[PDB]
Amino acid sequence: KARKGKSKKWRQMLQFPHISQCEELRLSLERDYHSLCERNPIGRLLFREFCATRPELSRCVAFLDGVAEYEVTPDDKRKACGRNLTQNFLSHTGPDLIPEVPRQLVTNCTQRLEQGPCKDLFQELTRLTHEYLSVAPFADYLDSIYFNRFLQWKWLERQPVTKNTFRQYRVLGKGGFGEVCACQVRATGKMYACKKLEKKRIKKRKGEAMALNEKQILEKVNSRFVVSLAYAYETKDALCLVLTLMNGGDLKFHIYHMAGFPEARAVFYAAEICCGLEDLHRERIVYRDLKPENILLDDHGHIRISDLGLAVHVPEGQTIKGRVGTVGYMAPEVVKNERYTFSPDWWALGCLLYEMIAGQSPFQQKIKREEVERLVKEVPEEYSERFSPQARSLCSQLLCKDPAERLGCRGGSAREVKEHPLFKKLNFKRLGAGMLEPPFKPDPQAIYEPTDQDFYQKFATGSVPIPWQNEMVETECFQELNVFGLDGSVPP
Amino acid sequence: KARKGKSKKWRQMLQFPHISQCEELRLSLERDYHSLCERNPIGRLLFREFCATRPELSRCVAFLDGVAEYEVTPDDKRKACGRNLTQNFLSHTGPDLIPEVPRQLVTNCTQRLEQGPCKDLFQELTRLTHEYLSVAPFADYLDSIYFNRFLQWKWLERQPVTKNTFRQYRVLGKGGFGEVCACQVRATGKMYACKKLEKKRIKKRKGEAMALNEKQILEKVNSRFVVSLAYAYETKDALCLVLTLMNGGDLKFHIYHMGQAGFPEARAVFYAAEICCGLEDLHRERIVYRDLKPENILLDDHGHIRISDLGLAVHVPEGQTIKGRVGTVGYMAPEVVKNERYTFSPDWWALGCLLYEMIAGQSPFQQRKKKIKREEVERLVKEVPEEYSERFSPQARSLCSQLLCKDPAERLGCRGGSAREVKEHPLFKKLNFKRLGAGMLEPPFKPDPQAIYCEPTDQDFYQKFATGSVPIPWQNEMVETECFQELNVFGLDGS
Numbered sequence: 001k002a003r004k005g006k007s008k009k010w011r012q013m014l015q016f017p018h019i020s021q022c023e024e025l026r027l028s029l030e031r032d033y034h035s036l037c038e039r040n041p042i043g044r045l046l047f048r049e050f051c052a053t054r055p056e057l058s059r060c061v062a063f064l065d066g067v068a069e070y071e072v073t074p075d076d077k078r079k080a081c082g083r084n085l086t087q088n089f090l091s092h093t094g095p096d097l098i099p100e101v102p103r104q105l106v107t108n109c110t111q112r113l114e115q116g117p118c119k120d121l122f123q124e125l126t127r128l129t130h131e132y133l134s135v136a137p138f139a140d141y142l143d144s145i146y147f148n149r150f151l152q153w154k155w156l157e158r159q160p161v162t163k164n165t166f167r168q169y170r171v172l173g174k175g176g177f178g179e180v181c182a183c184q185v186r187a188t189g190k191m192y193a194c195k196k197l198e199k200k201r202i203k204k205r206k207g208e209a210m211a212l213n214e215k216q217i218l219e220k221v222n223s224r225f226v227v228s229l230a231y232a233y234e235t236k237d238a239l240c241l242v243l244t245l246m247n248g249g250d251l252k253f254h255i256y257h258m259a260g261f262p263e264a265r266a267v268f269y270a271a272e273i274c275c276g277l278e279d280l281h282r283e284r285i286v287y288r289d290l291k292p293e294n295i296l297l298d299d300h301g302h303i304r305i306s307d308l309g310l311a312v313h314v315p316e317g318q319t320i321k322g323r324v325g326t327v328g329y330m331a332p333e334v335v336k337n338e339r340y341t342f343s344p345d346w347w348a349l350g351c352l353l354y355e356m357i358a359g360q361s362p363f364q365q366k367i368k369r370e371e372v373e374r375l376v377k378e379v380p381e382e383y384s385e386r387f388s389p390q391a392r393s394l395c396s397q398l399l400c401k402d403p404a405e406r407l408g409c410r411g412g413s414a415r416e417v418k419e420h421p422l423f424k425k426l427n428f429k430r431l432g433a434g435m436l437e438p439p440f441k442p443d444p445q446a447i448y449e450p451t452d453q454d455f456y457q458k459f460a461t462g463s464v465p466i467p468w469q470n471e472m473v474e475t476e477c478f479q480e481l482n483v484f485g486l487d488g489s490v491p492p
Numbered sequence: 493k494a495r496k497g498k499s500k501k502w503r504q505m506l507q508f509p510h511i512s513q514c515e516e517l518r519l520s521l522e523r524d525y526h527s528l529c530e531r532n533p534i535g536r537l538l539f540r541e542f543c544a545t546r547p548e549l550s551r552c553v554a555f556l557d558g559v560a561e562y563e564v565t566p567d568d569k570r571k572a573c574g575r576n577l578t579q580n581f582l583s584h585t586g587p588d589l590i591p592e593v594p595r596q597l598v599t600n601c602t603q604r605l606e607q608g609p610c611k612d613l614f615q616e617l618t619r620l621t622h623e624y625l626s627v628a629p630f631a632d633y634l635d636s637i638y639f640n641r642f643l644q645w646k647w648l649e650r651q652p653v654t655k656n657t658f659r660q661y662r663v664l665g666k667g668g669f670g671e672v673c674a675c676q677v678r679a680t681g682k683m684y685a686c687k688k689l690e691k692k693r694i695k696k697r698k699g700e701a702m703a704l705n706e707k708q709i710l711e712k713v714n715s716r717f718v719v720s721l722a723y724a725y726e727t728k729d730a731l732c733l734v735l736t737l738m739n740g741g742d743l744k745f746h747i748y749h750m751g752q753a754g755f756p757e758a759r760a761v762f763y764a765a766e767i768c769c770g771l772e773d774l775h776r777e778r779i780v781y782r783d784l785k786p787e788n789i790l791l792d793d794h795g796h797i798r799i800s801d802l803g804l805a806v807h808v809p810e811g812q813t814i815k816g817r818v819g820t821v822g823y824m825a826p827e828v829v830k831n832e833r834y835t836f837s838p839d840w841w842a843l844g845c846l847l848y849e850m851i852a853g854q855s856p857f858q859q860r861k862k863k864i865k866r867e868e869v870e871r872l873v874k875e876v877p878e879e880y881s882e883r884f885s886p887q888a889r890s891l892c893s894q895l896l897c898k899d900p901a902e903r904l905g906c907r908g909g910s911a912r913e914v915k916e917h918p919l920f921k922k923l924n925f926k927r928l929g930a931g932m933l934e935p936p937f938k939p940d941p942q943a944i945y946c947e948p949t950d951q952d953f954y955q956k957f958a959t960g961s962v963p964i965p966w967q968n969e970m971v972e973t974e975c976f977q978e979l980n981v982f983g984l985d986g987s
């Protein structure tokens with residue numbers, strides 16, 4: 001019933017269930033350490049809290065934190081940082097970090113650091129730590145009170161989502177199947193965007209398989225550089241996708257409201273999109289609609305890949321076929337209706353980097369579909385003195401016409417691209433963990449039927465675990481409601 | 493493995509069990525709210541923490557705390573205090589304190605207070621509040637994470653107790669079956685006394701039934717005025733009772749260590765009041781003590797007393813009487829020396845002796861130094877009025893004489909109103925018994941800080957005796973030492 005953005009009723013909305021009510025749920029869940037204790041953000045935090053009870057488990061976690069921090073530590077400070085780690089967790093007089101740690105392994109480590117503080121050094125130890133944690137600490141965790149607490153959060157996570165989970169605000173823009181508008185979760189105060197697809201227009205244009213595809217892709221992907229789906233639910237008129245709120249406008253807007261960007265800036269965006277594409281390809285997803293309009297900015301000026309309607313899964317070992325995408329941005333293979341896995345995407349990245357610098361698309365101004373397609377297949381892109389050599393270098397290697405020889409497709413994937421000298425200045429680990437400030441910060445822009453029922457049920461699955469659990473942690477609902485034994489403890 | 497007093501290993505000694513380990517224990521335990529959520533100190537706290545999650549449950553607890561506070565509030569401040577409670581929990585515009593509270597009840601309360609802030613005013617509301625808490629909140633609690641936590645605490649409570657649970661320190665004194673010495677719990681740092689009974693001497697003197705009786709009485713009683721039994725366990729040589737440590741000496745020592753034996757009234761009166769409370773607590777459990785004398789009242793560090801040495805105590809079944817000349821010669825009542833039957837009247841007579849002796853510096857029917865033969869003492873007990881001096885104010889003499897009344901039917905404490913008869917004597921005019929009862933009045937004397945440092949039958953009996961930790965003292969121990977608060981808390985550690 002309606003009226004830091006949180007409802008006055010939030011504590012009730014998130015009131016925990018009884019323990020008994022979480023029993024089916026226990027037996028229903030998959031017994032997988034990696035998911036329960038690393039991926040699910042709340043599972044991770046509760047497992048950590050379990051570990052904090054025991055000194056041996058707690059030094060493992062401290063060590064894992066030690067590494068994660070060392071991995072994103074600037075190149076100049078990184079040797080001392082790793083020196084600190086060994087002195088504190090690998091001392092020949094200290095306690096063994098984990099049972100039966102191979103002691104040659106530790107000697108490799110010691111001396112591999114002494115010559116080269118590369119960010120891999122602690123990989124084997126990391127992997128043996130998780131290995132250890134995964135067995136007995138895990139079994140104990142499951143039989144601890146901390147897992148009861150986890151089941152209680154999981155139960156909340158799986159509760160029905162309806163329109164009454166949210167407040168709606170103003171329309172943000174219009175999309176082929178409905179509007180997109182700003183919304184806010186009542187329990188937590190967290191803002192999102194909400195894309196509506198009207199059941200009428202889906203059924204009329206029969207875009208069921210395609211709308212379902214966009215949703216399933218969005219939920220499987222978990223990337224700082226791709227818009228996340230937090231929730232998927234139905235109204236009486238529509239299917240909704242609640243998504244990361246990207247309020248800084250897209251790149252088409254930003255290139256052209258002057259046209260073009262200083263190198264530093266264009267490079268920063270290319271690096272982030274490159275990560276987004278890495279994250280996507282890791283999940284075996286080819287995006288296929290990379291263009292400036294589909295890259296949105298957030299309030300701090302980081303970007304994300306948006307609109308995944310044309311994306312598709314590429315099964316292991318196979319290729320797929322299909323001319324789809326926008327005319328000026330489609331790669332040679334695609335326009336020739338040849339078979340591909342991932343190459344189209346790296347071609348688009350080139351166009352997009354090109355267009356960011358040139359203030360213009362490399363094969364389109366408008367010119368007729370035919371002639372643009374001929375230029376794409378047969379004609380070299382033209383550079384001006386707006387491109388430093390390295391910019392031109394990367395661009396042409398990405399806008400290479402043969403996909404076999406195109407950067408990002410020669411065998412090393414995203415790392416090929418990342419290693420181009422144009423990015424010499426940027427630390428990808430830090431970029432990937434969101435620790436590098438963007439060059440540009442946008443303007444704070446204001447806010448204030450059996451078939452079909454079968455399809456709607458497959459679609460409207462409700463809360464998505466990782467973003468949902470994240471939402472709870474970010475808004476501090478987790479911290480405030482999770483705690484225990486502080487409230488009626490101070491006597492009368 | 494040995495080396496604020498807590499062992500460095502304390503966190504591992506108290507490490508919680510797995511939840512599955514608590515399952516039989518769940519089903520084993522009796523589903524009783526009063527015990528689980530009021531008497532067991534840790535169950536009470538966890539139930540309160542459960543309540544804190546829900547505003548309606550938490551107002552009830554606030555109310556109960558409100559009343560508890562009002563009950564111990566000095567006479568002058570008590571009306572204001574109660575006006576405050578009404579305004580905050582019975583407002584005609586406020587939310588209902590509990591479902592279906594009868595509104596006439598509330599009107600009676602409002603206006604009763606308005607004319608007399610008596611300490612019972614909120615009793616019907618209190619009762620109704622527990623009544624409400626004991627059904628649905630209680631069922632929810634049971635099915636909450638907070639009970640899981642209770643079960644883990646209970647499991648720790650029921651773990652085996654051995655000599656390795658404690659450190660032993662110097663001998664304190666020597667008892668008929670063994671020594672008594674100071675000990676300390678390794679996990680918590682809490683000090684106790686430890687009374688050893690040697691299996692040899694018990695078997696030789698056959699004092700099995702009596703040693704078991706003392707132990708079972710000690711563990712049933714729960715009084716700020718009686719020594720508590722916190723643990724009972726066995727050694728290879730002995731049976732042990734771990735007891736509240738009373739280090740301030742006994743009253744026989746304190747009465748006679750002057751040169752000029754006796755206490756100023758205030759002081760004697762304070763002790764009488766505390767002993768009187770301990771006797772009420774015993775009698776409410778249907779226990780007649782039967783060995784009240786000055787040597788059996790111990791003082792603690794702060795100078796509060798407790799009744800000690802319950803070997804002659806006995807449970808008096810409902811409606812029946814008991815028989816038996818037991819006790820010490822000059823403190824036994826007329827009934828008892830005539831081998832007549834009694835329930836509780838012997839104890840009030842002893843209180844009379846004890847008060848008399850505190851003031852007179854002499855027992856009323858036996859002498860300090862040169863002692864009178866059993867038979868004569870017994871004659872003076874039966875037949876001769878005790879003698880007063882100008883050392884007794886009129887009211888002291890009044891109380892003493894009413895307690896040392898020879899016919900137990902007319903003796904104060906036994907006319908029908910029990911301890912309350914005694915408590916209402918004018919001699920206690922100045923003392924607030926609710927406060928006394930909750931430990932809030934400072935004693936007039938604080939003792940010297942006195943140092944501390946350094947077979948099938950039988951095995952069946954040993955098993956009946958060595959039951960380990962006693963719940964309420966145990967859970968209290970965990971709270972006072974702050975092991976409960978530190979270990980119980982959750983979701984702060986790797987957050």
Ligand SMILES: Nc1ncnc2c1ncn2[C@@H]1O[C@H](COP(=O)(O)OP(=O)(O)NP(=O)(O)O)[C@@H](O)[C@H]1O
Nearest residue numbers: 172173174175176180193243244245246247307309
């Ligand atoms: N996460 C978001 N945050 C803020 N605004 C958004 C978000 N997603 C979409 N929008 C806005 O909504 C507009 C239309 O949505 P968009 O997703 O681009 O199209 P669509 O609904 O996927 N169908 P189509 O555009 O034909 O493929 C965009 O131009 C954006 O301005």
Ligand SMILES: Nc1ncnc2c1ncn2[C@@H]1O[C@H](COP(=O)(O)OP(=O)(O)NP(=O)(O)O)[C@@H](O)[C@H]1O
Nearest residue numbers: 664665666667668669672685735736737738739801
């Ligand atoms: N709770 C305690 N705290 C400190 N000292 C105590 C405690 N209980 C007993 N003692 C000391 O141990 C002595 C002997 O204990 P006590 O309970 O007097 O003997 P007993 O074995 O019960 N036999 P009796 O007392 O003659 O019936 C007491 O006088 C005190 O010196």
Ligand SMILES: [Mg+2]
Nearest residue numbers: 174175176307
């Ligand atoms: Mg669009």
Ligand SMILES: [Mg+2]
Nearest residue numbers: 666667668801
């Ligand atoms: Mg003794």
